[PDB]
Amino acid sequence: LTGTGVLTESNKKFLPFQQFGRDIADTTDAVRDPQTLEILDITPCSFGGV
Amino acid sequence: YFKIYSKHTPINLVRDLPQGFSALEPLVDLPIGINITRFQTLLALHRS
Numbered sequence: 001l002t003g004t005g006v007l008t009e010s011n012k013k014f015l016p017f018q019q020f021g022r023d024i025a026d027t028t029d030a031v032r033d034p035q036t037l038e039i040l041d042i043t044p045c046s047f048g049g050v
Numbered sequence: 051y052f053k054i055y056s057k058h059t060p061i062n063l064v065r066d067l068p069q070g071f072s073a074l075e076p077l078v079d080l081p082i083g084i085n086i087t088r089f090q091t092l093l094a095l096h097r098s
């Protein structure tokens with residue numbers, strides 16, 4: 001799952017089967033990591049117009 | 051793939067299915083790839 005973004009800690013209650021929960025635009029929003037089975041948030045790197 | 055979804059909800063309604071909502075979480079996916087057209091339930095006997 002290649003992608004660029006800032007990872008944080010997540011309170012999203014991923015049930016045991018859930019691993020890589022998405023959002024509206026079918027891009028990954030929160031992923032459960034391998035080797036740890038811990039849940040992380042994916043919010044995109046800060047952007048905006050100049 | 052033969053998938054199994056499950057849920058165990060505490061009920062007390064005597065005969066029919068309960069009136070309400072209950073989601074069935076997936077339990078295990080079986081990578082079997084066989085031909086299935088029939089199924090049968092397994093029960094037990096009672097000798098006293």
Ligand SMILES: *[C@@H]1O[C@H](CO)[C@@H](O)[C@H](O)[C@H]1NC(C)=O
Nearest residue numbers: 019032033034035036037038
């Ligand atoms: C290895 O990954 C498994 C999950 O498949 C995890 O349960 C285990 O703690 C991991 N071990 C190490 C040493 O990272």
Ligand SMILES: *[C@@H]1O[C@H](CO)[C@@H](O)[C@H](O)[C@H]1NC(C)=O
Nearest residue numbers: 051082083084085086087088
């Ligand atoms: C499964 O068996 C039936 C006959 O009972 C046959 O018609 C069908 O093509 C078979 N399917 C596969 C995937 O083998």
